[model samples]
Target: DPEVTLLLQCPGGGLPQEQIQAELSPAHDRRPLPGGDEAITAIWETRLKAQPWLFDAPKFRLHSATLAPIGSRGPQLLLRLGLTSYRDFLGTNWSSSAAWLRQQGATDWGDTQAYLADPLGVGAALATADDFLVFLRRSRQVAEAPGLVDVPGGHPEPQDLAGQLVVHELFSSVLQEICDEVNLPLLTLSQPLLLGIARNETSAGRASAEFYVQCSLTSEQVRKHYLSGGPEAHESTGIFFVETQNVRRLPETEMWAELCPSAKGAIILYNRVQGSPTGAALGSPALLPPL
Candidate 1:
């Protein structure tokens, strides 16, 4: 049903069994949520009692993966989860609830210095057809991240699990997100090339898989479709196309200053893959030494 073609590289390999086990293992030192389990419970109870509509979603623990070294062949997907829920609950809004819990005398609110360990796997599609990157300015209506410059993406959903393995599931999730957010059919995009994973231990509260792929349309077409107002207009305020020469110039724009860290990381990774000089400065400590 799409007017374009999908062009993914390494289409067959799924997540290895060993990798899945590593993700499920509890021995890995994951960051604990602020206030611990008791604080989380109290906040949930208080919020729900005060406003029943606040925490109505069914809660379930879900694994999210973060790929490091965004250009690795067999990059490690560090799996983790938060309080876990569907349409936002304790797990999703833990930061806000933690503040409320503190007011209610919930002492074990944990160290404020430590980041909330809600490591979610986000897919960032640095989509290009000709020689430009497609970027989106998020609308203010989104529940979690509002008014941020971001790629078309979100967390891996239950439907993504239909894939044969975890990697396959993650890949499918990326495609689904791009289609949903940009109003482009999955068949129109090319297979996403794994760029690498990025982790932000602070504000982002999660890590993400940075993927790059070539689309069937030219840069102008993508802009025309998204900017003219499509189904995604509700979630995205504007669509932008940046040329390779202007990639490094991102930090000069107001959008770059206001970009969510994850999106910043994604663009940095994009620059790195493109061998931009600016990418050298955005390198993570764990991967490339900071410039």
Candidate 2:
């Protein structure tokens, strides 16, 4: 594999609270009908009690990242994180129906749509010699979207925001995610290609900033390393090296039912930029001037 060094021009801070709150105000206003914001806040309080790792962390929105053309050099990507709190964003109110759905054992557990206004999620894709690495998430009865096919990723933590900007923090979190999920050391992987950012807005008014990365490791090496002494037994149920050509075909495969919406969106963007199966550029590069 060719050595890849990403030249990222990320500015400090992230999306502002005014913007995030405005995007979520419609849903926030509805809280009064179900006993006001207090009721909503209590639910999140209980959540933090259960998942203490999320306590008092800095949470940023994903809308600040922009994509554009960069002459003939392919896509140039840029991102910035504004000052926001996990509490403010995660404290959103849920619908009565969501509670009912949870009681009914539905996967669509909380007011996910309402809480989707300012989602902060992360992911990294490992590009091997023959295929890209994707994983089947193990079932977590209490987690959202259990049994979904996803890339290696999770939410950013408090430490991830210690820096002035989230660029370095994001990369640190991505590396940690790989270690946590697949037990792969950073030394074993090459510098990742920043494949740009994409946003997803569900019909329910939920939105997400999806980040993508192309790693330099062969599928065979990754699998062997991961399987020999990896943590798949706890982190994933199965590991699949999706053929580069077949990467675009994921939406049509049986695994489609298991693919997370964000993962699917990221893959689609990856396929678009990587071009056709014959190794051709499909569209104008998504380039941007330096920050």
Candidates in order, TM-scores: namely 0.63, 0.62
CA lDDT of each candidate?
0.53, 0.49
Question: Which candidate comes out best when scored by TM-score?
Answer: 1
Off by over 4 Å in 2: 1-40, 46-56, 68-80, 93-117, 158-164, 200-217, 229-234, 277-291
Q: Could you tell me which residue pairs clash in candidate 1?
A: 7-190, 7-191, 8-191, 35-109, 67-197, 70-195, 70-196, 70-197
Candidate 1 global TM-score: 0.63
After TM-score superposition, the amount by which residue 80's alpha carbon in candidate 2 deviates from its true location, in angstroms, is: 4.9
The residue-by-residue lDDT of candidate 1 on 43-126, one tens digit each, is 667777877875344221333445445345653445443334433334433465434433333344343323233434555645
lDDT of 2 by residue, 138-180 (tens): 5656355677777787767544233233455655676677767
RMSD of each: 9.4, 10.5
lDDT of 2 at 200: 34
Highest-scoring model, lDDT = 1
